[PDB]
Amino acid sequence: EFKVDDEKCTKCGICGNLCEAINVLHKPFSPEIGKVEGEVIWDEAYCDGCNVCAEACPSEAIKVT
Amino acid sequence: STLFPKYSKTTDGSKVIMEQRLLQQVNNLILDNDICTGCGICSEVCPEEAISVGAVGGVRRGLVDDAASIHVDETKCSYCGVCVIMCPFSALALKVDGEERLPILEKEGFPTYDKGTAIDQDKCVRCNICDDVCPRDAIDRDVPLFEGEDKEGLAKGQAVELKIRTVVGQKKLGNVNIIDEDCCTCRWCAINCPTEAITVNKIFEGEITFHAEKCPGGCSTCVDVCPANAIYLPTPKPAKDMKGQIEAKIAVNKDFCILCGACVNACPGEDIIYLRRDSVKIKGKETDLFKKIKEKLFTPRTSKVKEQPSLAGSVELKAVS
Amino acid sequence: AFAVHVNMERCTGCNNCVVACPVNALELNTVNPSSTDKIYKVINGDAVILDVKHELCAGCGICVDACPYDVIQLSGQPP
Amino acid sequence: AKGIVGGGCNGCGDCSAVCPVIKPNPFEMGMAPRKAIYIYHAQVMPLIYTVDFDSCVKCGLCVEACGDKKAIDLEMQDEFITVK
Ligand code: SF4
Ligand code: SF4
Ligand code: SF4
Ligand code: SF4
Ligand code: SF4
Ligand code: SF4
Ligand code: SF4
Ligand code: SF4
Ligand code: SF4
Ligand code: SF4
Ligand code: SF4
Ligand code: SF4
Numbered sequence: 033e034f035k036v037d038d039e040k041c042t043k044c045g046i047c048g049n050l051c052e053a054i055n056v057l058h059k060p061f062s063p064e065i066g067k068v069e070g071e072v073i074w075d076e077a078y079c080d081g082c083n084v085c086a087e088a089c090p091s092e093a094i095k096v097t
Numbered sequence: 098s099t100l101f102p103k104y105s106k107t108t109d110g111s112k113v114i115m116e117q118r119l120l121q122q123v124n125n126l127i128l129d130n131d132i133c134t135g136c137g138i139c140s141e142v143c144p145e146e147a148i149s150v151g152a153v154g155g156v157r158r159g160l161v162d163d164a165a166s167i168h169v170d171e172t173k174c175s176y177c178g179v180c181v182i183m184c185p186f187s188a189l190a191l192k193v194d195g196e197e198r199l200p201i202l203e204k205e206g207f208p209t210y211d212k213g214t215a216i217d218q219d220k221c222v223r224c225n226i227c228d229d230v231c232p233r234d235a236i237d238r239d240v241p242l243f244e245g246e247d248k249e250g251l252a253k254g255q256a257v258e259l260k261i262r263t264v265v266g267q268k269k270l271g272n273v274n275i276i277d278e279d280c281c282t283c284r285w286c287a288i289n290c291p292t293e294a295i296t297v298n299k300i301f302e303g304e305i306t307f308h309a310e311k312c313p314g315g316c317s318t319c320v321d322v323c324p325a326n327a328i329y330l331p332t333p334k335p336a337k338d339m340k341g342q343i344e345a346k347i348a349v350n351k352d353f354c355i356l357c358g359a360c361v362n363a364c365p366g367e368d369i370i371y372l373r374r375d376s377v378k379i380k381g382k383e384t385d386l387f388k389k390i391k392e393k394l395f396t397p398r399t400s401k402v403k404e405q406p407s408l409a410g411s412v413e414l415k416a417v418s
Numbered sequence: 419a420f421a422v423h424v425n426m427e428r429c430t431g432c433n434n435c436v437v438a439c440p441v442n443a444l445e446l447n448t449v450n451p452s453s454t455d456k457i458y459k460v461i462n463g464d465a466v467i468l469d470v471k472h473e474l475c476a477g478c479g480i481c482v483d484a485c486p487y488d489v490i491q492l493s494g495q496p497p
Numbered sequence: 498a499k500g501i502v503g504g505g506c507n508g509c510g511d512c513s514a515v516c517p518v519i520k521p522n523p524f525e526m527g528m529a530p531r532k533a534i535y536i537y538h539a540q541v542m543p544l545i546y547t548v549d550f551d552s553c554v555k556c557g558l559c560v561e562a563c564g565d566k567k568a569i570d571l572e573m574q575d576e577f578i579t580v581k
Contacts, residue, residue: 046224120528160479160482386555
């Protein structure tokens with residue numbers, strides 16, 4: 033079902049702030065990289081076919097089914 | 098003698114309050130020791146040479162109790178308020194009677210820093226990155242809190258303007274700003290904003306260099322005290338990847354360094370760090386005093402071991418030619 | 419140029435204030451050592467501060483944070 | 498004598514109205530504030546408004562307030578005179 037495109041994701045919380053399934057962990061910010069980088073974790077136990085977060089993402093980084 | 102010029106220096110909790118009593122007129126230079134960062138841009142700028150810098154690393158780490166980052170001789174201070182205008186992270190305030198009052202600005206006798214902050218609300222998307230990466234607590238994002246971490250601000254389905262189908266255009270629920278008296282112009286939020294909607298310009302310009310080969314290892318005081326977290330300990334490589342290059346001991350990110358000076362004031366080394374500012378960015382016209390202050394801020398500096406004993410209790414740096 | 423005071427009565431000679439001081443670590447652990455003077459040396463089981471005239475300390479707090487049974491008080495105010 | 502025809506100090510008080518430094522007044526035994534540029538009291542005989550150089554921050558607001566009178570010279574030094 034769910035699939036993110038880490039190629040086009042900026043790790044903006046506006047995708048994990050909506051659903052209770054999407055929890056976005058920003059691993060600690062270090063000037064090493066100087067960038068934001070984390071992971072998007074989706075759990076089945078909370079989803080729906082709502083698909084709101086597909087278009088809530090600023091980018092098109094989320095396709096769900 | 099005479100008593101009524103009562104000079105007092107009280108440490109009321111976390112605020113060091115420096116005062117000058119009269120019958121009805123007071124003068125309160127109040128330093129908020131939770132926000133000071135140990136830079137000396139308050140000691141370099143003091144027209145009357147009263148503010149000195151103390152145990153920056155210890156105080157900024159919490160291991161010192163009987164002192165603040167800075168000591169102000171309130172008998173010498175003149176309550177001009179130049180330190181309050183020229184402190185990049187506003188951790189110094191002047192209260193004349195009982196109110197934060199700056200006569201020199203009221204008369205326009207001194208320029209102020211142009212941090213120039215702004216967030217084009219027609220481009221910001223209520224993301225959470227700018228509040229997350231901000232080294233200081235200076236992003237005031239006013240957004241209703243949806244099902245993420247709380248009860249719905251409106252509803253998961255009302256976070257997107259949906260007609261219940263297709264989305265109608267754009268959502269942008271709420272409003273995000275930058276507390277302009279707290280931003281230090283690090284640019285972590287502009288460099289990492291997803292939609293390039295943040296406009297901040299560094300107050301200082303110049304260059305800082307790190308001679309990694311002179312850091313004595315386990316001294317991450319510079320890392321601990323950097324306000325804009327520009328400094329890092331370069332992560333040791335794994336095996337089968339070292340490739341004969343061992344590692345650096347310390348380095349900096351010039352994209353985020355704001356040329357404050359806390360690193361130089363804190364390093365116990367000899368000349369690991371080289372700091373030199375070239376141009377401060379201001380609004381307000383100028384003054385002969387401001388030209389003197391520019392000349393004072395723009396002299397290159399570096400650490401020093403074994404400074405003179407007669408000034409024990411404070412910091413003295415090296416003048417670089 | 420601050421002043422450090424070591425409570426000799428509860429110092430155990432652990433030597434983790436000598437090893438952890440970044441001014442002590444300048445001699446052997448730096449490329450082209452600048453200054454080779456040392457704040458602490460454990461003589462007769464307790465840490466002695468050779469930095470009598472308070473010229474080399476930098477208020478780092480690496481030594482206060484290092485001692486296992488807090489015994490080093492760092493003074494951030496002029497002696 | 499120095500060439501300013503418009504004059505020197507007329508005791509208007511604009512300088513001390515704009516000075517931002519505030520210090521105790523030794524005439525009032527310290528009970529009262531006075532700016533860096535000041536007179537002890539309103540009945541001083543030379544009404545000429547000394548500048549307290551130990552406490553002045555050279556902000557230059559006083560000279561702008563004085564204006565064309567040009568009575569304020571912030572770089573003045575101790576002059577020595579010999580009298581028989
Ligand atoms: S899915 Fe979209 S909103 Fe969520 S983290 Fe990725 S880019 Fe940001
Ligand atoms: S599709 Fe709907 S329910 Fe599922 S994760 Fe996205 S927003 Fe949440
Ligand atoms: S200039 Fe630096 S040291 Fe001085 S008060 Fe401001 S933050 Fe603190
Ligand atoms: S108010 Fe003026 S004189 Fe007093 S400490 Fe600040 S800069 Fe120095
Ligand atoms: S990082 Fe940029 S887009 Fe995201 S909330 Fe901040 S200003 Fe808005
Ligand atoms: S410039 Fe730095 S301190 Fe200012 S708002 Fe952005 S991240 Fe925060
Ligand atoms: S790296 Fe830049 S911001 Fe950080 S302490 Fe050094 S000069 Fe200040
Ligand atoms: S630069 Fe200074 S604070 Fe950083 S490791 Fe070297 S000596 Fe320690
Ligand atoms: S505060 Fe730092 S420099 Fe001073 S004695 Fe302790 S470890 Fe050494
Ligand atoms: S670390 Fe503490 S206990 Fe050990 S020698 Fe130093 S002062 Fe004594
Ligand atoms: S110095 Fe100038 S402004 Fe001040 S009282 Fe004299 S004439 Fe007026
Ligand atoms: S130059 Fe001196 S007397 Fe004139 S306004 Fe500034 S502080 Fe006051």
